[PDB]
Amino acid sequence: GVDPKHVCVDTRDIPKNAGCFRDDDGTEEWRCLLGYKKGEGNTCVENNNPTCDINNGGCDPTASCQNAESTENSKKIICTCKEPTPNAYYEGVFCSSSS
């Protein structure tokens, strides 16, 4: 349990429209940046029509998801990590609630 700043060292090749995060438990995972979705299993691709539903729109359940529509795909899904999550895994695609 710590503030989400764990950063990452994951996976051979993490998708360009993606980012990896290595969590508190020591896990190594990657996800698809906000306003993006999963393509060929291990690729992230700009969704440009993101909905809140899909992993909170691309957020972490500890990242308050707000569905919105903006010129930017990354500005469509709003991921807000709460007080016990002072940090965000990448853009808020994931967060850690144990700081």
Swiss-Prot record:
Domain EGF-like span(s) in chain numbering: 6-48, 49-97
Glycosylated position list: 25
Lipidation (GPI-anchor amidated serine): 96
Disulfide bridge positions per record: 8-20, 32-44, 52-65, 59-79, 81-95
Biotechnology annotation for this entry: Potential candidate for the development of parasite blood stage vaccines. In vitro, neutralizing antibodies against the p19 subunit are capable of inhibiting parasite growth in host erythrocytes.
Protein name per the record: p19 subunit
Source taxonomy: Eukaryota, Sar, Alveolata, Apicomplexa, Aconoidasida
